[model samples]
Target: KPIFKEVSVHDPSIIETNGTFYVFGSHLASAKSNDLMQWQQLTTSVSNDNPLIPNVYEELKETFEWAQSDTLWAADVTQLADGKYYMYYNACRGDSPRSAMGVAVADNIEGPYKNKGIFLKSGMEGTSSDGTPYDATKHPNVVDPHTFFDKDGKLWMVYGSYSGGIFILEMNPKTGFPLPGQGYGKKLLGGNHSRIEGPYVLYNPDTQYYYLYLSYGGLDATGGYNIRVARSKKPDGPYYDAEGNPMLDVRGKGGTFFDDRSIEPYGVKLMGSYTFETENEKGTGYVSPGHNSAYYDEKTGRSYLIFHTRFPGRGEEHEVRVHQLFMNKDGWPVAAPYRYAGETLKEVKQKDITGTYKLIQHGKDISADIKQTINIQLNKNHTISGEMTGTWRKTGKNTADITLAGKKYNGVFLRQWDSVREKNVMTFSVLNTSGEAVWGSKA
Candidate 1:
């Protein structure tokens, strides 16, 4: 079956650890499930001991006078290599429009997390590359945080505001802190361009392309919040949209989409559906409703983009929905429809090929034209691991056996392989773990 059925989970950040799936989001609430679909509301007393909260607010207040309410907001959760959970959440002074992001760590997904104060703060940090000072007058500027581990095993955090725009920063895995003085935050998109916000970073292992999934337009019943994407080879990217335009420029130019106004009443305009601007329109509101995150499913070997939208006049109190995202032959992501009608999602049975396969050369043991074997293993942890094993005997060239596991698995990189065919001949690589580079693979 599909891992999980679509539910009202909005701005959901999911991590599968030790066969359990943990998801946390917007309301500062957490949910857990063994499978992907059904969720169990964690009622275990919410404590500052949770992984999402590293530095307790009371302790912060006692030590540095940091306000307690300035601690939590929409958060992204990740499981580190050591199995400890790290949560990056947005923080803002209830009185100040200015914002910051903080981190917390927990031993378990269902956390009594300890809060670590302010991981990223705007304005006070500095002005933009263009010298525009961050505007604190904007409400909900810093909201969503999407954390990803790059191919180089370095941690990175991507976040933005409905007001300010999108930004990328590197995170230190050891300290769980944003790297200081080493990297710079680049504006990927947002601000003027159709309210572009909620960026989710994804890496396609098969295509080796990095995709940034985001929402464009407002987030009301009028449907301004549609998903868009860009691709690059680097995690910290100069990704370009389908039209070959940079998202940063696209937002700076104020891109927009039409709201589905036909559904709204003729006289009264919905907030997002071409509403009238009034002199004192306090409650009239703006139509900006897209905050999203990306999740990769190990079972199906697919990726998904999950985000939230609002009903026409409902504001932010509306239910959330998720769409199954797929990439087309042209390497573009297509989000499935937002409706479900009792259809059962099926799971793919991985090809039945398991065991320790080796790489060898047919003609000469020392020949460079060696064959490699790709083995897929169903792990005891209910996860699948793949390995590429081969031997390398390049005439006294270190005389090594190379094993490349899935990069996601234990940080094992580089696989050696070869293809040889005479009409129906097969391909192969060496599988001799003699001298060096002989770690097992997990893909």
Candidate 2:
């Protein structure tokens, strides 16, 4: 049995360089993987105790005296057209927005990067142009930086967290920094005291949409952390959900709504707290899996969702997990329940789709992990028998549409290894009209 072990990580950012996958995360922690299935911690990638750029914090501390910690938050690295890698890093003091995000340059991905300077800072109390005081929440905390290039070859950076909201800025292609006079380009989504953070943007040429993926709620085990996505036609967007609702004003249902099920109807929920058990008793699950980074491998035309997850019994501890990402018929991304294992994207024949399956609905429950194994049978006569009876049919080379429980679901069927069963098994994932994802694997 190929039992996969967990690698310690949090708020992970991933990139592929020279055929090796590098994940950089909070607290200057890092690991590398050759096949994305196994990872080894990079002990010497940064300083043993202070892995982040030491000089960057020291310099920023001189100006913003409140910058009181060397502990790094989320760091993003990208290889720009200049042939150099730019590492965006941030540090803060006790959850205060008095934080700063800085940039460093390294010739290689693993580096003793040289600190350039502070790119953006938070916690600046100021007055509006009309002499009115600016709302503190309007100024974002300068953490969780993600840099990418638009289809037109223009460089851009997206960042923010809990306080203000997510924002984007144009960057100089050569320098890998913000363009001159571009002060926090624009707010893409999520503000007004909402509990949303961890912003990652990907431009899919196939759909011609810039998908913004984010984490909602607190990141801890009981915090109800989950992943959600919204998309925009342009890099700077009036981003909208599948139902055409603006993602900017949607907030988690507060007060007695501890589970925050009210926020479930907002964004396209990708993956949430889930568990899968097999007859062999080898089951795997996550308490709160979120704060993700995504990658599209051009060589194989595959997309991946990389993030950190906490286990059921392990309270605050987290480990890195990567799952295969598939685009649904409507162009939203759907994540597989299990970690990626070099699964092929070939279509599954109708005969192969039948069997006892462990199914899960990535539900938005803050307190409970919703991993249910329901027996579902895909009959050869284009009908589903078990759990919820429905009719099914192929929609594309690797896609299908199944109508179950009076709701239709867009599905993609592929062959994936079921680690608990110790064999290659057929699996399928579907997204229903409610924006919930349901995954099933043959047992």
Q: Best by TM-score, which number?
A: 2
lDDT of 1 by residue, 27-121 (tens): 46566666444567542222455343334455334212332353455678887777777877665554443565667677877665666666445
Q: What total of clashing residue pairs does each candidate reach?
A: 40, 0
Per-residue lDDT of model 2, residues 138-243, tens digit only = 5567789999988898888999886657888988888777986656557876554566789999887777899999898788777778888889998878888777
With a 3 Å backbone cut-off (N, CA, C), the pairs that clash in candidate 2 are none
Give the CA lDDT, 0 to 100, for residue 388 in model 1.
Answer: 40
Q: Would you give me the overall lDDT of model 1?
A: 0.47
For residue 437, model 2's alpha carbon misses the true position, in angstroms, by: 0.7
TM-score of each: 0.59, 0.90
Model 2 collision count: 0
Candidate 1 local lDDT, residue 206? 73
